[PDB]
Design an enzyme around this catalytic site. Structure first.
Site, PDB file in Angstrom:
ATOM      1  N   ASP A   9      12.594  -4.473   6.863  1.00 41.29           N
ATOM      2  CA  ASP A   9      11.365  -5.242   6.752  1.00 41.29           C
ATOM      3  C   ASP A   9      11.093  -5.604   5.300  1.00 41.29           C
ATOM      4  O   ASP A   9      11.121  -4.741   4.420  1.00 41.29           O
ATOM      5  CB  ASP A   9      10.195  -4.443   7.313  1.00 41.29           C
ATOM      6  CG  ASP A   9      10.291  -4.252   8.801  1.00 41.29           C
ATOM      7  OD1 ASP A   9      11.331  -4.626   9.377  1.00 41.29           O
ATOM      8  OD2 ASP A   9       9.326  -3.734   9.399  1.00 41.29           O
ATOM      9  N   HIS A  57       8.213  -7.728   4.712  1.00 35.53           N
ATOM     10  CA  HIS A  57       6.758  -7.659   4.875  1.00 35.53           C
ATOM     11  C   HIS A  57       6.016  -8.396   3.764  1.00 35.53           C
ATOM     12  O   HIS A  57       4.981  -7.942   3.280  1.00 35.53           O
ATOM     13  CB  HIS A  57       6.279  -6.212   4.985  1.00 35.53           C
ATOM     14  CG  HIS A  57       6.193  -5.718   6.393  1.00 35.53           C
ATOM     15  ND1 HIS A  57       5.524  -6.408   7.380  1.00 35.53           N
ATOM     16  CD2 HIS A  57       6.706  -4.614   6.985  1.00 35.53           C
ATOM     17  CE1 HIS A  57       5.618  -5.743   8.517  1.00 35.53           C
ATOM     18  NE2 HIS A  57       6.333  -4.652   8.306  1.00 35.53           N
ATOM     19  N   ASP A  96       9.946  -9.099  10.374  1.00 41.69           N
ATOM     20  CA  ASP A  96       8.766  -8.693   9.601  1.00 41.69           C
ATOM     21  C   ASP A  96       8.817  -9.270   8.183  1.00 41.69           C
ATOM     22  O   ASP A  96       8.970  -8.566   7.185  1.00 41.69           O
ATOM     23  CB  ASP A  96       8.602  -7.170   9.598  1.00 41.69           C
ATOM     24  CG  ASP A  96       7.941  -6.662  10.863  1.00 41.69           C
ATOM     25  OD1 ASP A  96       7.807  -7.455  11.815  1.00 41.69           O
ATOM     26  OD2 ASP A  96       7.579  -5.470  10.920  1.00 41.69           O
ATOM     27  N   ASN A 110       8.340  -7.986  15.039  1.00 41.00           N
ATOM     28  CA  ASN A 110       7.098  -7.892  15.796  1.00 41.00           C
ATOM     29  C   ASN A 110       5.918  -8.539  15.084  1.00 41.00           C
ATOM     30  O   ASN A 110       4.895  -8.796  15.725  1.00 41.00           O
ATOM     31  CB  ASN A 110       6.787  -6.431  16.104  1.00 41.00           C
ATOM     32  CG  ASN A 110       6.242  -5.690  14.913  1.00 41.00           C
ATOM     33  OD1 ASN A 110       6.863  -5.652  13.852  1.00 41.00           O
ATOM     34  ND2 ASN A 110       5.078  -5.078  15.083  1.00 41.00           N
ATOM     35  N   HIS A 111       6.029  -8.807  13.786  1.00 38.44           N
ATOM     36  CA  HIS A 111       4.961  -9.460  13.042  1.00 38.44           C
ATOM     37  C   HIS A 111       5.135 -10.967  12.963  1.00 38.44           C
ATOM     38  O   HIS A 111       4.466 -11.612  12.153  1.00 38.44           O
ATOM     39  CB  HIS A 111       4.852  -8.873  11.636  1.00 38.44           C
ATOM     40  CG  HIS A 111       4.165  -7.547  11.597  1.00 38.44           C
ATOM     41  ND1 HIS A 111       3.570  -7.047  10.461  1.00 38.44           N
ATOM     42  CD2 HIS A 111       3.970  -6.619  12.563  1.00 38.44           C
ATOM     43  CE1 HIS A 111       3.041  -5.866  10.726  1.00 38.44           C
ATOM     44  NE2 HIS A 111       3.271  -5.583  11.994  1.00 38.44           N
ATOM     45  N   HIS A 141      15.273  -5.501  15.315  1.00 38.34           N
ATOM     46  CA  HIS A 141      14.079  -5.069  14.598  1.00 38.34           C
ATOM     47  C   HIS A 141      13.473  -3.829  15.241  1.00 38.34           C
ATOM     48  O   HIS A 141      13.353  -2.779  14.602  1.00 38.34           O
ATOM     49  CB  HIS A 141      13.045  -6.190  14.537  1.00 38.34           C
ATOM     50  CG  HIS A 141      11.750  -5.762  13.927  1.00 38.34           C
ATOM     51  ND1 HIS A 141      11.626  -5.460  12.589  1.00 38.34           N
ATOM     52  CD2 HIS A 141      10.528  -5.556  14.473  1.00 38.34           C
ATOM     53  CE1 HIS A 141      10.383  -5.096  12.335  1.00 38.34           C
ATOM     54  NE2 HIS A 141       9.695  -5.149  13.461  1.00 38.34           N
ATOM     55  N   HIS A 151      11.960  -1.375  12.208  1.00 38.15           N
ATOM     56  CA  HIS A 151      10.540  -1.539  12.489  1.00 38.15           C
ATOM     57  C   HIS A 151       9.671  -0.432  11.895  1.00 38.15           C
ATOM     58  O   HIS A 151       8.469  -0.645  11.705  1.00 38.15           O
ATOM     59  CB  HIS A 151      10.346  -1.647  14.006  1.00 38.15           C
ATOM     60  CG  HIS A 151       8.929  -1.860  14.430  1.00 38.15           C
ATOM     61  ND1 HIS A 151       8.004  -2.504  13.638  1.00 38.15           N
ATOM     62  CD2 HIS A 151       8.282  -1.525  15.571  1.00 38.15           C
ATOM     63  CE1 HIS A 151       6.844  -2.541  14.266  1.00 38.15           C
ATOM     64  NE2 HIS A 151       6.987  -1.961  15.443  1.00 38.15           N
TER      65      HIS A 151
HETATM   66 MN   LIG Z   1       7.017  -3.940  10.072  1.00 29.70          MN
HETATM   67 MN   LIG Z   2       7.925  -4.461  12.774  1.00 32.24          MN
END
Ligand SMILES: [Mn+2]
Ligand SMILES: [Mn+2]
Lengths: 290, 194, 211
Positions: free
Chosen positions: A52, A54, A80, A112-113, A162, A236
């Site tokens: 990630d 982010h 992410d 997931n983001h 992920h 994740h």
């Molecule tokens: Mn994440």
């Molecule tokens: Mn994630």
């Protein structure tokens, strides 16, 4: 076009965001490129599997200094890209530009983001409003996120992903037959693909995140033997050591955002795969900021 | 303000010690300040003290360290001579050509890029060139388009008699490759080389 | 013991042959002359036969200057048609030189028997390098694996460096002391096991010669 893409990449290297028409011509070309890619995208070794990001753009620059520049180093990012980094827009724009310019030297997966609700809640929508005034760029990026491949497969052995596995998923043919061109649901095999975590447990379980499941060593072993896989790469969850082996070295969790949230103090890592799948981990501190 | 004798007496063992530091920015600063030491030190002292680490930086785990060492090789060669380059750096760089790991091969082509301009014409065209033509059949595309880019970069530096003799057939061969990026960089090399 | 029992006397034939043949005072035999015999591009095996057959009569103390020319030309001795007598005589001379200069001779022979694909292929193998990693002596030219007179030499160096690594590790342990004994013993046992496994893999009839 190619010269324009290279100019955009060398502009985005120093955190200058692209314009609205640039986001138009970039996202609507990444839509064309990502359409051809399957849900289980076949990545050929060598590749550097990353976790990630982010939205931490300067940490992504540190990642590029550690592992190498694209297209010299093949990269595989497990989602992410956004959501509570200070420069999520620049990060996702730069990685999408690298995907467009070098379609075979980087594979970007859905995390997931990259859902509409998750970006609405956790500050990517607010960042787009602050940096652009309107809201078309956010939904442009989420429409691109709908096109992102769910999983990756390195040599038929390393199953990059992920999140984790699903109770409803037993084969990779199920993943290939998933209709990935959709918003991430609250339940289902796609939500479990993007949201699940591993655990030290005796089977399946409900994840504390409220979406996805959690799975133990026996589930990972059954999935690996039933599909001819030696490893399941994962991104994740947050790791203070950067990477963490799980389930008797069947699942490895790789986090690539050092000092996550600018407060966690973690010391992130990336996984470099060799010509013959001789893995190597490159832990790196958060980059200095001046 | 002090001088290289007292610095070599006092601080040189310390900086040699933390040139193998865990944190890569410390090693990056050490590499960046190696030309400073090479300015005031003789070739024999620098050989018996300060080249095991200078060659070991090329096989580092961090790309920035290898890039800094590659850019440092030019500063070392342009001061200590083509003969020192051929005696010390060239066998160690050529050792990275047959290395199974892919980024060591890209490191030796970056060494080609920074060493062609400082090794002259004849030394370049009789040592550096055959390796670059040899490794154009590598099964990893990241090596192959780097071969195309390196042949573009070292093209004007190498001997012009060998250019159309050798580089152009392998550039056409790389232009007929399966990967898109290899074809693009091969045709870029063909257009710039002309 | 194999490097020591060879000095034991048998029947006095060698002293007799030395006395009756070395007194010919044909002093053309020299490291330079033997080097010129090896370095001939139209290489003749007869001249090197004559020189090394004369060299077998020499004592070990007076065979010292021939060590460099004997070692550094061992790559030519694998070149697909070298007579067995040349290899056997070179092995005999190496065994003679092993009794007076083994620490230097092993380093020179390891540096000589490299594959030599590159210009040096790490010709800077020191004694410290070989005592750190004794398995370096198994990274030879790979044509030696079907050359029994050079298997004798490489097995001698392998056994010697395997023995020397134990003393080197004990010395490094005591020097850096200023548990680790268990880790040193595990490293030594794994090192000998790896050497045995590589030796057994050399014994395998590789598929190039299988069909
Ligand atoms: Mn994440
Ligand atoms: Mn994630």
């Amino acid at each position: 076009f190619t010269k324009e893409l290279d100019q955009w990449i060398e502009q985005l290297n120093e955190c200058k965001q692209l314009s609205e028409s640039q986001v138009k011509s970039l996202c609507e070309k990444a839509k064309e490129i990502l359409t051809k890619e399957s849900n289980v995208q076949e990545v050929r070794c060598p590749v550097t599997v990353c976790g990630d990001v982010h939205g931490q753009f300067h940490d992504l620059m540190e990642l590029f200094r550690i592992g190498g520049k694209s297209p010299d180093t093949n990269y595989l990012f497990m989602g992410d890209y956004v959501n509570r980094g200070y420069y999520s827009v620049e990060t996702v724009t730069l990685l999408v530009a690298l995907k467009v310019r070098y379609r075979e030297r980087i594979t970007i997966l859905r995390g997931n983001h990259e859902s509409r609700q998750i970006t609405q809640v956790y500050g990517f929508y607010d960042e787009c409003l602050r940096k652009y005034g309107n809201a078309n760029v956010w939904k442009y990026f989420t429409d691109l996120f709908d096109y992102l491949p769910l999983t990756a497969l390195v040599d038929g052995q390393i199953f990059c992903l992920h999140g984790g596995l699903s109770p409803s998923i037993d084969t990779l043919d199920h993943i290939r037959a998933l209709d990935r061109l959709q918003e991430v649901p609250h339940e289902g095999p796609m939500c479990d693909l993007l949201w699940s975590d591993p655990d030290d447990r005796g089977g399946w379980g409900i994840s504390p995140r409220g979406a996805g499941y959690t799975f133990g060593q026996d589930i990972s072993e059954t999935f690996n033997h039933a599909n001819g896989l030696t490893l399941v790469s994962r991104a994740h969850q947050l790791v203070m050591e950067g990477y963490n082996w799980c389930h008797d070295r069947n699942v490895v969790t790789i986090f690539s955002a050092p000092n996550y949230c600018y407060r966690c103090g973690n010391q992130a890592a990336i996984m470099e795969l060799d010509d013959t799948l001789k893995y190597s981990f490159l832990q790196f501190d958060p980059a200095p900021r001046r | 303000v002090i001088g290289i004798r007292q610095l070599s007496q006092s601080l040189l063992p310390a900086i040699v010690e933390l040139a193998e530091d865990a944190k890569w920015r410390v090693r990056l600063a050490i590499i960046e300040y190696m030309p400073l030491l090479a300015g005031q030190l003789g070739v024999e002292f620098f050989d018996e003290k300060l080249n095991s680490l200078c060659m070991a930086w090329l096989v580092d785990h961090v790309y920035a360290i290898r890039e800094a060492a590659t850019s440092n090789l030019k500063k070392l060669v342009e001061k200590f001579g083509k003969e020192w380059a051929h005696a010390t750096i060239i066998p160690k760089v050529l050792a990275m050509s047959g290395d199974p790991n892919y980024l060591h091969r890209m490191t030796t082509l970056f060494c080609i890029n920074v060493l062609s301009e400082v090794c002259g014409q004849d030394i370049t065209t009789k040592h550096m060139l055959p390796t670059v033509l040899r490794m154009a059949g590598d099964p990893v595309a990241n090596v192959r388009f780097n071969v195309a880019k390196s042949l573009q970069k070292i093209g004007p530096i190498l001997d012009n008699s060998t250019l159309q003799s050798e580089v152009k057939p392998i550039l056409e061969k790389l232009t007929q490759d399966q990967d898109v990026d290899v074809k693009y960089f091969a045709q870029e090399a063909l257009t710039v080389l002309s | 013991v194999d490097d020591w029992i060879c000095e034991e006397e048998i029947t006095g034939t060698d002293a007799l042959l030395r006395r009756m043949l070395l007194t010919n005072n044909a002093k053309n035999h020299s490291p330079k002359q033997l080097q010129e015999a090896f370095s001939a591009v139209p290489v003749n095996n007869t001249q090197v036969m004559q020189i090394i057959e004369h060299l077998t009569l020499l004592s070990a103390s007076e065979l010292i200057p021939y060590a460099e020319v004997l070692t550094s030309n061992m790559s030519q001795l694998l070149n697909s048609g070298v007579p067995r007598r040349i290899l056997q005589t070179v092995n005999k001379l190496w065994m003679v030189l092993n009794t007076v200069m083994p620490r230097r001779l092993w380093v020179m022979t390891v540096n000589a028997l490299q594959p030599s694909i590159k210009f040096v292929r790490q010709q800077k193998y020191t004694q410290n390098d070989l005592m750190i990693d004794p398995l370096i002596v198994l990274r030879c030219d790979q044509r030696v694996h079907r050359c029994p007179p050079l298997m004798d030499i490489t097995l001698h160096m392998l056994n010697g460096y395997l023995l020397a690594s134990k003393a080197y590790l004990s010395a490094h342990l005591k020097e850096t002391e200023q548990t680790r004994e268990e880790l040193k013993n595990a490293l030594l046992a794994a090192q000998d096991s790896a050497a045995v496994q590589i030796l057994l893999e050399i014994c395998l009839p590789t598929e190039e010669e299988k069909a």
